[PDB]
């Protein structure tokens, strides 16, 4: 039995100042499409059934 988590977010603007120590610098990774891995998952489900 799981309980749910609820958060809050805020933009930045003139007079709006959010702390940036918790910000993480993550560059974009190697680009891939999510449909390719679902097609691979369809193949693997088929192969498991085989």
């Amino acid at each position: 039995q799981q309980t749910t988590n609820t958060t809050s977010t805020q933009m930045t603007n003139i007079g709006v100042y959010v702390s940036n120590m918790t910000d993480k610098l993550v560059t974009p990774g190697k680009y891939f499409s999510a449909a390719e891995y679902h097609a691979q998952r369809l193949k693997a489900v088929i192969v498991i059934q085989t």
């Binding site: 799981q2 749910t4 988590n5 609820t6 958060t7 809050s8 977010t9 805020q10 933009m11 910000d23 993480k24 610098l25 993550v26 560059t27 974009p28 990774g29 190697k30 680009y31 891939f32 499409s33 999510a34 449909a35 891995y37 679902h38």
Partner: protein, 87 residues
């Protein structure tokens, strides 16, 4: 390739899924300049990957109070474009 920096404000997932969210947001941005099709592309790709459901909100100015499942929440940036994805 436009070097749009990925600034993550809040990510309640794992890193390999946060990176996939960033990449899907970039592909949706290059596919369409409309946030409707951007959020539709992100939601349909993540629904194709992970079975139950997903919900995506893409925009430059929005305040979102949402309740999510565990390990199924992210709010990040892509340049000046903010993307929310949660289950």
């Amino acid at each position: 390739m436009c070097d749009r920096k990925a600034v993550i404000k809040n990510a309640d997932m794992s890193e390999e899924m946060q990176q996939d969210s960033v990449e899907c947001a970039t592909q949706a941005l290059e596919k369409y300049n409309i946030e409707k099709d951007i959020a539709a592309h992100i939601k349909k790709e993540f629904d194709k990957k992970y079975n139950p459901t997903w919900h995506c909100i893409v925009g430059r100015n929005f305040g979102s109070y949402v309740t999510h499942e565990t390990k199924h929440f992210i709010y990040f940036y892509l340049g000046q474009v903010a993307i929310l994805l949660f289950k």
